[PDB]
UniProtKB/Swiss-Prot annotation:
Family assignment from sequence similarity: Belongs to the peptidase A1 family.
The keyword Transmembrane helix appears for this protein: no
Region of the whole protein represented: 90 to 419 of 419
EC number, UniProt record: 3.4.23.22
Record flagged with keyword Magnesium: no
The species this protein was found in: Cryphonectria parasitica
Name of this protein: Endothiapepsin
Length: 330
């Protein structure tokens, strides 16, 4: 089997991407944030505290003839941005782009933090990291990809995120029309539960490539590119007027600037992020100070190849017995 679904930016900045997902019988379609940095499929629901729902579409398990309470199971998750959610668990039928899993754990939110409530466009998350990170207790549950893997034509999914445009998540096949050149594969460590790999270095604009190992994670659920302070300083030093602002929470730059590109290494191959992809617009409405799309990871504990980086590439998440990651230009 295979599946193919379009993923769409939630706003004009590409702050995140939503993909429609069919849950239950008859189908209830929710727009979920596919997140290769976590491993829980959770949704706004008829059980979510009413004051914490503001425009989202909800899953109502009582209206699904295939829903079943997973007795005793609870979940609770906290994300790197300080947001969180928690609740109980049903199993139900879940379909993405024509690919159907029966018995998928659907984590029903009883509580969500303010940032989820405040984002009316995201109805929940669909985790695509390794199932060892799933938070369901006392019986950990499998991701959608883990459950579908055996049925797929090939045990892979691909992320093709658009810049200010829709893109595609495919399951079970590699669309050879969706990228240019060849796909360069690189090793993955699953020891932390992430799609964790080592970039071979970077360049800023037309500058020379610096060969240096950068361990980080491929994370479709993080907006920006978070890299070591040395790398980020070298990038922003090429932008007149750019500075790190403690009050804003990262590097800012004059909105009148033209930003240089940023290149990262994948083995001997190179992925070029155009400068425009690094512009996240005014820090507040009407400001001439703009927020940078490359930020320091020094306070995180891990480097994060988020959407800024991934949307410059066609990315293969290879879930073979030994997982690997593939990157191609497009």
């Amino acid at each position: 089997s295979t599946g193919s679904a379009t993923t769409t930016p939630i706003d004009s900045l590409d702050d995140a991407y939503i993909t429609p997902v069919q849950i239950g019988t008859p189908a209830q379609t929710l727009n979920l944030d596919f997140d290769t940095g976590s491993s829980d499929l959770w949704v706004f629901s008829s059980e979510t505290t009413a004051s914490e729902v503001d425009g989202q579409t909800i899953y109502t398990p009582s209206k699904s003839t295939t829903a079943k309470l997973l007795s005793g199971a609870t979940w609770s998750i906290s994300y790197g941005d300080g947001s969180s959610s928690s609740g109980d668990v049903y199993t139900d039928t879940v379909s993405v782009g024509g690919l159907t899993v029966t018995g998928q754990a659907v984590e029903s939110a009883k509580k969500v933090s303010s940032s989820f409530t405040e984002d009316s466009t995201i109805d929940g998350l669909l985790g695509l990291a390794f199932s060892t990170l799933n938070t369901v207790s006392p019986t950990q549950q499998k991701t959608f990809f883990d459950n579908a893997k055996a049925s797929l034509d090939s045990p892979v999914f691909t992320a093709d995120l658009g810049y200010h445009a829709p893109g595609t998540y495919n399951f079970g096949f590699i669309d050879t029309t969706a990228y240019t050149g060849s796909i360069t594969y690189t090793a993955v460590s699953t020891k932390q539960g992430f799609w964790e790999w080592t970039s071979t270095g970077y360049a800023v604009g037309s500058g020379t490539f610096k060969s240096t190992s950068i361990d980080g994670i491929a994370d479709t659920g993080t907006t920006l590119l978070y890299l070591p302070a040395t790398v980020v300083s070298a990038y922003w030093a090429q932008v007149s007027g750019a500075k790190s602002s403690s009050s804003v929470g990262g590097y800012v730059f004059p909105c009148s600037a033209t930003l240089p590109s940023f290149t990262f290494g994948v083995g001997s191959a190179r992925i070029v992020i155009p400068g425009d992809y690094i512009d996240f617009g005014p820090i507040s409405t009407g400001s001439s100070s703009c927020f940078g799309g490359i930020q320091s990871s020094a306070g995180i504990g891990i480097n994060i190849f988020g959407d800024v980086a991934l949307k410059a590439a066609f990315v293969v998440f290879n879930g073979a017995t030994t997982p690997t990651l593939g990157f191609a230009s497009k």
